């Protein structure tokens, strides 16, 4: 993966980089040291071991060591590099992580660089261990200390990362329904994309956190067939992936979806809800292909023709999640950034919640469809330590 990095001069006469090697050793020049100031101000992710492929649009792939030195010394204050690495934690010490996080928090002005470098490069399980060690050493909960030390969207990312997956989803669900309206897009995204085991844990933790059940909150915030679909999905009782492929049921479900929708006036919505909530995901993938044998429109086209509003939005999201969940998230990521500004709520939630699930597939679907990497879009839309946290959650270019 070719990453793009923008460095800025920190001292008069210096970017803060120790360059290494060159075409003398038949390799491209390589970064060997980055000043802490450069690490804080650069845009992107620059690692020790990145080969420098281009500089301000000039290909320096085949340059000797002193050739790239002259280029950088005669460049301006801001320089753009194209780089590529020359091809959890391994020595995980929760106590050392907790100590370094405390030192970063207690540094005058807060050392966000260190907080991000650690937390976004530990697994959620390791973060829980760090949090336990932190409370012991400091008598403060880690999440409270960081809530006070951080602000803006960086605070949102870091606090999201510190919750268990179930706690994070439950609080995101609660936020989508709190207040006079509903954030249907977020409610749909979570309810349509979580599996049985995730929803079972969400249902349990939601009741512990909020002293009321998710289902009652959904009923109090939604109505009509939109409510029926959300309630059914949230129960998390979809059939598990079987070993036997049920070809007779595949054909019958495809016929039933057709007979309930495009073939008749109006729609038999309970029939759509039953089939699409109860059958396993691999079964429904084959149902949707068999559906095209009977229907002139595929399942997504049929939904747009049959229903509208929240119900339509939900069926469309559900079908995408069934057909190709990594591509579903790649598209939502793209939509969160493509236009003016950023839908940060969505961008953050996906990067936090999928970083340990299927981020490799998301990045692959994203680059295949959109041509540039997810890294690249995050870099154009966000800045600062917040950008850095999302890029680490991304996990590389391409």
């Amino acid at each position: 993966g070719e990453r793009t990095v923008t460095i800025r001069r920190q001292t008069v006469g210096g970017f803060g980089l120790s360059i290494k090697g060159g075409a003398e050793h038949n390799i491209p020049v390589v970064v060997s040291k980055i000043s802490k100031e450069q690490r804080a101000e650069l845009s992107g992710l620059l690692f020790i071991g990145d080969a420098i492929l281009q500089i301000n649009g000039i290909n320096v792939r085949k340059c000797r060591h002193e050739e790239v030195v002259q280029v950088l010394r005669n460049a301006g204050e801001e320089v753009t590099l194209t780089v590529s690495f020359l091809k959890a934690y391994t020595n995980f010490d929760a106590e050392r992580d907790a100590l370094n996080i405390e030192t970063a928090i207690k540094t005058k002005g807060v050392d966000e660089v260190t907080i991000v470098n650690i937390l976004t490069n530990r697994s959620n399980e390791q973060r829980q261990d760090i949090a336990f060690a932190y409370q012991r050493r400091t008598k403060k909960e880690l999440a409270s200390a960081l809530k006070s030390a951080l602000s803006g969207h960086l605070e949102t990312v870091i606090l999201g990362l510190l919750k268990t997956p179930a706690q994070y989803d439950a609080s995101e669900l609660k936020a989508s329904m709190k207040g006079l309206g509903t954030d249907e897009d977020s409610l749909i995204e979570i309810i349509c994309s979580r599996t049985n085991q995730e929803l079972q844990e969400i249902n349990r933790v939601y009741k512990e956190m909020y002293k009321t059940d998710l289902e009652k909150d959904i009923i109090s915030d939604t109505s009509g067939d939109f409510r029926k679909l959300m309630v059914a999905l949230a129960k998390g009782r979809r059939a598990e992936d079987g070993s036997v492929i049920d070809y007779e049921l595949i054909d019958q479900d495809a016929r039933d979806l057709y007979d309930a929708g495009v073939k008749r006036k109006g729609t038999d919505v309970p029939k759509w809800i039953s089939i699409m909530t109860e059958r396993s995901v691999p079964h429904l993938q084959k149902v949707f292909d068999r559906y095209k044998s009977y229907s002139p429109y595929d399942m997504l086209e049929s939904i747009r023709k049959e229903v509208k509003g929240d119900l339509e939005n939900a069926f469309l999201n559900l079908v995408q999640c069934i057909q190709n969940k990594p591509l579903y998230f790649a598209d939502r990521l793209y939509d969160s950034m493509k236009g003016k500004g950023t839908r940060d709520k969505v961008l953050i939630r996906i990067m936090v919640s999928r970083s340990e699930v299927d981020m490799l597939k998301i990045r692959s679907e994203f680059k295949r469809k959109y041509g540039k990497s997810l890294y690249y879009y995050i870099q154009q839309d966000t800045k600062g330590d917040y950008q850095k946290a999302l890029l680490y959650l991304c996990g590389g270019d391409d």
Binding site: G14, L17, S18, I19, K20, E24, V69, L72, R73
Partner: peptide, 10 residues
Amino acid sequence: EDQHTQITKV
């Protein structure tokens, strides 16, 4: 798998 490399601060 290589020799002693040159290092330059820029």
